[PDB]
Structure 1
Amino acid sequence: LPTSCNPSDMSHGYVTVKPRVRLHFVELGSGPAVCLCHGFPESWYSWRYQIPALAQAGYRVLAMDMKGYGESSAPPEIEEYCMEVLCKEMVTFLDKLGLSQAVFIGHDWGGMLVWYMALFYPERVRAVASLNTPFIPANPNMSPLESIKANPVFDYQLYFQEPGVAEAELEQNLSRTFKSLFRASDESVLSMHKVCEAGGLFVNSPEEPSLSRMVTEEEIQFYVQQFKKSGFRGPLNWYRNMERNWKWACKSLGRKILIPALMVTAEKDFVLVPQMSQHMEDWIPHLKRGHIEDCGHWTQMDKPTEVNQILIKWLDSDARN
Structure 2
Amino acid sequence: TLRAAVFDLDGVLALPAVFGVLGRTEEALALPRGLLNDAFQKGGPEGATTRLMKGEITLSQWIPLMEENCRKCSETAKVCLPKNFSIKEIFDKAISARKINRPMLQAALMLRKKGFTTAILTNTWLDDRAERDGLAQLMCELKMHFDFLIESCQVGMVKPEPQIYKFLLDTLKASPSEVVFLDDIGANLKPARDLGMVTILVQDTDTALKELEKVTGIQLLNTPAPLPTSCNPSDMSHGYVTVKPRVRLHFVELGSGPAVCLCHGFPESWYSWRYQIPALAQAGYRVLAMDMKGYGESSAPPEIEEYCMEVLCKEMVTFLDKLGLSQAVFIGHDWGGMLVWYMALFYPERVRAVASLNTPFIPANPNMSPLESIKANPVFDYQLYFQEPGVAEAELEQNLSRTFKSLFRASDESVLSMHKVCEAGGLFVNSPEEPSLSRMVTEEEIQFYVQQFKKSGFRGPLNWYRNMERNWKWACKSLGRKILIPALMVTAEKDFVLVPQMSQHMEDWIPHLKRGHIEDCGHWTQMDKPTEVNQILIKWLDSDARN
Post-superposition offset of 1:117: 0.0
Aligned-pair RMSD on alpha carbons? Answer: 0.6
Q: Deviations over 1:271-290 (max 9, x none)?
A: 00000001101101220000
Write the distance in 2 (CA, Å) between the matches of 1:140 and 1:197: 29
Post-superposition offset of 1:22: 0.1
Aligned-partner SS, 1:229:
helix
Q: Relative CO higher for 1 or 2, CA cutoff 8 Å, sep ≥ 6?
A: 1
Write the distance in 1 (CA, Å) between the matches of 2:421 and 2:527: 26
| 1:6 lines up with 2:232 in the alignment | yes
TM-score by length of 1: 0.99
The answer for the alignment partner of 2:352 in structure 1 is 126
Write the distance in 2 (CA, Å) between the matches of 1:128 and 1:93: 17
Aligned-partner SS, 1:27:
strand
Post-superposition offset of 1:194: 1.3
Write the distance in 1 (CA, Å) between the matches of 2:383 and 2:329: 29
Judge conservation of contact 2:327–2:349 (CA < 8 Å) in 1. yes
Aligned-partner SS, 1:24:
strand
Q: Mean Cα displacement is larger for which, 282-291 or 296-305?
A: 282-291
Write the distance in 1 (CA, Å) between the matches of 2:478 and 2:417: 35
Q: Mean Cα displacement is larger for which, 294-303 or 151-160?
A: 151-160
| 1:149 lines up with 2:375 in the alignment | yes
Q: Deviations over 1:23-70 (max 9, x none)?
A: 000000000000000000000000000000000000000000000000
Judge conservation of contact 2:330–2:351 (CA < 8 Å) in 1. yes
Write the distance in 1 (CA, Å) between the matches of 2:286 and 2:433: 41
Q: Deviations over 1:263-315 (max 9, x none)?
A: 00000000000000011011012200000000000000000000000000000
Judge conservation of contact 2:240–2:251 (CA < 8 Å) in 1. yes
Judge conservation of contact 2:492–2:522 (CA < 8 Å) in 1. yes
Write the distance in 2 (CA, Å) between the matches of 1:226 and 1:236: 15
Q: Deviations over 1:206-251 (max 9, x none)?
A: 1100000110000000000000000000000000000100000001
Write the distance in 2 (CA, Å) between the matches of 1:73 and 1:79: 14
Post-superposition offset of 1:74: 0.2
TM-score by length of 2: 0.58
Aligned-partner SS, 1:187:
coil
The answer for the alignment partner of 1:312 in structure 2 is 538
Q: 1:1-321 to 2 correspondence within 5 Å? A: 1-320=227-546
Write the distance in 2 (CA, Å) between the matches of 1:118 and 1:101: 11
Q: Deviations over 1:66-125 (max 9, x none)?
A: 000000000000000000000000000000000000000000000000000001000000
Write the distance in 2 (CA, Å) between the matches of 1:227 and 1:294: 29
Could you list the structure 1 runs, at least 4 aligned residues long, displaced by more than 2 angstroms after superposition: none
Write the distance in 1 (CA, Å) between the matches of 2:364 and 2:399: 37
Aligned-partner SS, 2:456:
coil
Write the distance in 1 (CA, Å) between the matches of 2:356 and 2:468: 20
Structure number with bigger Rg: 2
Write the distance in 2 (CA, Å) between the matches of 1:41 and 1:253: 29
Aligned-partner SS, 2:412:
helix
Write the distance in 1 (CA, Å) between the matches of 2:463 and 2:349: 28
Write the distance in 1 (CA, Å) between the matches of 2:382 and 2:339: 21
Aligned-partner SS, 1:13:
strand
Q: Mean Cα displacement is larger for which, 147-156 or 100-109?
A: 147-156
Aligned-partner SS, 2:364:
coil
Write the distance in 2 (CA, Å) between the matches of 1:25 and 1:84: 21
Write the distance in 1 (CA, Å) between the matches of 2:417 and 2:347: 37
Aligned-partner SS, 1:71:
coil
Write the distance in 2 (CA, Å) between the matches of 1:279 and 1:185: 25
Write the distance in 1 (CA, Å) between the matches of 2:290 and 2:231: 14
Aligned-partner SS, 2:243:
strand
Write the distance in 2 (CA, Å) between the matches of 1:220 and 1:50: 18
Post-superposition offset of 1:253: 3.3
Write the distance in 2 (CA, Å) between the matches of 1:154 and 1:314: 30
Write the distance in 1 (CA, Å) between the matches of 2:540 and 2:497: 25
Post-superposition offset of 1:317: 0.1
Judge conservation of contact 2:363–2:479 (CA < 8 Å) in 1. no
Post-superposition offset of 1:196: 1.0
Aligned-partner SS, 2:279:
helix
Judge conservation of contact 2:493–2:521 (CA < 8 Å) in 1. yes
Write the distance in 2 (CA, Å) between the matches of 1:25 and 1:12: 6
Write the distance in 1 (CA, Å) between the matches of 2:302 and 2:416: 28
Write the distance in 1 (CA, Å) between the matches of 2:257 and 2:417: 43
Write the distance in 1 (CA, Å) between the matches of 2:348 and 2:330: 11
Aligned-partner SS, 1:127:
strand
Aligned-partner SS, 1:191:
coil
Write the distance in 2 (CA, Å) between the matches of 1:216 and 1:253: 44
Post-superposition offset of 1:162: 0.2
| Gaps in structure 2 of 5+ consecutive residues | 1-226
Judge conservation of contact 2:364–2:479 (CA < 8 Å) in 1. no
